[PDB]
Design a protein around this ligand. Sequence first.
Ligand SMILES: CCOc1ccccc1-c1ccc(-c2nc3c(c(N[C@H](C)C(=O)O)c2C#N)CC=NC3)cc1
Ligand SMILES: CCOc1ccccc1-c1ccc(-c2nc3c(c(N[C@H](C)C(=O)O)c2C#N)CC=NC3)cc1
Lengths: 307, 319
Amino acid sequence: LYFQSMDPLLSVLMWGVNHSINELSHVQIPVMLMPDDFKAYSKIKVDNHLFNKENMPSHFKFKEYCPMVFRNLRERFGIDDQDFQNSLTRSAPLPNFHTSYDKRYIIKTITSEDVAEMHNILKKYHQYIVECHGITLLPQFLGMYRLNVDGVEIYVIVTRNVFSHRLSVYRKYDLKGSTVAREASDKEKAKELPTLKDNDFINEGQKIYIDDNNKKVFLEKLKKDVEFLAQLKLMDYSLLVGIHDVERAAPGEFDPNIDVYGIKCHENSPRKEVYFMAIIDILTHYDAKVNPEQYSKRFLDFIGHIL
Amino acid sequence: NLYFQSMDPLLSVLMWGVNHSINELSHVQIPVMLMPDDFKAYSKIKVDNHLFNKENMPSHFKFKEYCPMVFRNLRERFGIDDQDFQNSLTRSAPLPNRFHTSYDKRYIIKTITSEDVAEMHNILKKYHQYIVECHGITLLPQFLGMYRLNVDGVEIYVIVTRNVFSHRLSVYRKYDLKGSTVAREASDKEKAKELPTLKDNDFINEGQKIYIDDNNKKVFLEKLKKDVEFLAQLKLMDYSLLVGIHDVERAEQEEVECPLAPGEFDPNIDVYGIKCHENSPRKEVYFMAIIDILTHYDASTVNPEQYSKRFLDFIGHIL
Ligand SMILES: CCOc1ccccc1-c1ccc(-c2nc3c(c(N[C@H](C)C(=O)O)c2C#N)CC=NC3)cc1
Ligand SMILES: CCOc1ccccc1-c1ccc(-c2nc3c(c(N[C@H](C)C(=O)O)c2C#N)CC=NC3)cc1
C-alpha cells in the first residue's frame, strides 16, 4: 500500500483514512459519547522534503470531524474499523461521486455549509441511530473530512452504498414525490446507467413487487425516518432505487449484512428482481430555503403509491 | 493496545512520532540504494486536536524526522527490524537514567542540540558509506533515528542509538574512558549514585582489570583502530570508550532474594559483549563500544590525530 493516485486529493483521502483509523486504535472506546465529542476534530499537516516524493504530494492537510462519533456510528451500523480502513485504502476509489474500490461505500465532495449542517443535526442523528438500533433507511454517515493539497481545499463525506457491493443494477431512480414534474435530461439519459426521476418511473410504468410483510416493514421504517427528517426541518431528499435483474445472469442471492438495503421481489413477480432502496441527500434545511411536514407527507404518499 | 501516555509530554510525542514514522515507512518502497537527496530529506507532521484524545496526549505538537530513508537503511544494516524497533520505543515509555533507555533496554534516547543535528548531517554520507564497507561490524555508535519534537513551547532534538550494554544482563560497574588530559574522575555527587559513570582515574585507582583472552583483545583493538582512524579523518574528537561490566555472581545473589545460562548472552542482540577468559578471578562479561562522537575540531587542546593516538594508546594499555 502506497496510496498512489493520479488524483492527489484521493491519495490524501486514502492516506487520511489510513491515519484516522490507526490513530483511533490508540484511543479507548468510551462507555458513551459526551457533548464535547460532537464538537471535536483532529487536524494533521504534513510537509515532506525529498521524502516519499513519488507516491504522494509533499505538502498536505487532513482534518477529521468528530472522530469518536463517526467511529461509534460505524460500530452501530455493523462496520469494523479495519474492514472500513481496508475498503477505502487498499485500492483507490473509482469515480462513478466516487465508490470505494470494493463498492461498499460512497465518497462525496460537499460544501462547508453541508459540513455545518452535519454538525447542526449530528447529536439528534446519533440519538436516532441509538434509538432505532441502527435499523433505518437514513444515510449511514461513516466519516467526514477536510483535505488541502496544492492550494485546493475540499470537504468529503462517506456513506454506505444503497446498492449491492456485487449484484449489478440495470436501472436506477431518484424519487421525491415532486408535484412539479422531474424527468432525467437527454444528457443523463445518454448514459449506460442513467439516474432517472419521478416522471421516468411513471412513464415507464415501473413496478416494484415486494411481499406484504416486506412492504409493511419497509414503509414503517420509512415513515419514522421521514418524521425524524421533518422534525429537523430537513427536506429535498430522495428515495434512491436500484433494480437488479436476476434473469440477466448463486443468481438471486445477497448477504443482508453487507447489502443491507436489498429486498427480494414477490415470488409471483413477472420478472425475477432484487431492489435496493434507501433515502439519500438529506442535508437541506428549511431556513436555507412547500414546507418540511408537507414535503415528508408528499414524499411518503408517492412511495406508498408505487410500493 | 498502546496510548503513548506519559507524565512527560515529550516522551508522549516521541512515542507517537516513532510509531507514525515507522508506519509511514511501511508505505514507502525500500530503494535498491540511497541517493544524495535522501541525506537532506525530512518529514514534518504538525498535529492539532480539539476535544479529542485529550487524556492520553497533548493536543498540539510537531514531530520532524531527519533523513528517514537513511535511518531505515541504517537500522537494516545494524540488524534491526523496523517493527521490533517500533515496539521497543512505543510499547511502554522510555525510562530516564541524562538519557533514557527504551523500556526493554535495547536502545538509548538522548536529547542533543541543534549543532549536534548539523554535525550528524555533516558526517551522514561518510558514516553510511563506512557502515556499508564494514558490513555493520563496528564499535561506532549505531545511529538509528533522529527527530525534532515540539510541545508546550519546548523544542528538543533527539537521537536514538543502540545500547552498549546488555538488554538482559545487568551492569554493576561502568566507565567513560578517554585517557590523557585529566583529573578525570567522577565527582563526589556522581559516585553517590547506585551505578555511577566512573572515569579514567577511577579505572586505574580502583585497580579495574578486563580479563579477555588474546584473540578477543586483538580482534577488538583492530576494530577500535579502524573506527578511531575513521573518526580522525572526519576531524571528530572528545569521544569515549564506554565499558560496562556484568558480574555473574552478583546478579545471582541479588536475584535469589526475589534458556540462556548465567553469564551467557545473545551476541546477535547484545552485539558488544565479550566473555571473560577462563582464568578470570570472577566470572564477568564486558560491554565496550565508542560513544559521544560528534565534536568537530574547528569547534593547549589536541588535534584529532593526537586525540586518536592517545585514546588507542590508553585503551591498549588497560586492555
Ligand atoms: C449533493 C449533496 O450531497 C451530499 C451533501 C451532504 C451530505 C451528503 C451528500 C450526499 C452523499 C451521498 C450521496 C449519494 N449516495 C449514494 C449514491 C449516490 N449516487 C447518485 C445520486 C447517483 O447514482 O446519481 C449518491 C450521490 N450523489 C448511490 C448509492 N448509494 C448512495 C448523495 C449526497
Ligand atoms: C552529549 C551529546 O550526546 C550526543 C550528542 C550527539 C549524538 C549522540 C550523543 C550521545 C548519544 C548517546 C550516548 C550514550 N550512549 C550510551 C550510553 C550512554 N550513557 C551515559 C554516558 C552514562 O552511562 O552515563 C550515553 C549517554 N549519555 C549508555 C549505554 N549505551 C550507549 C551519549 C551521547
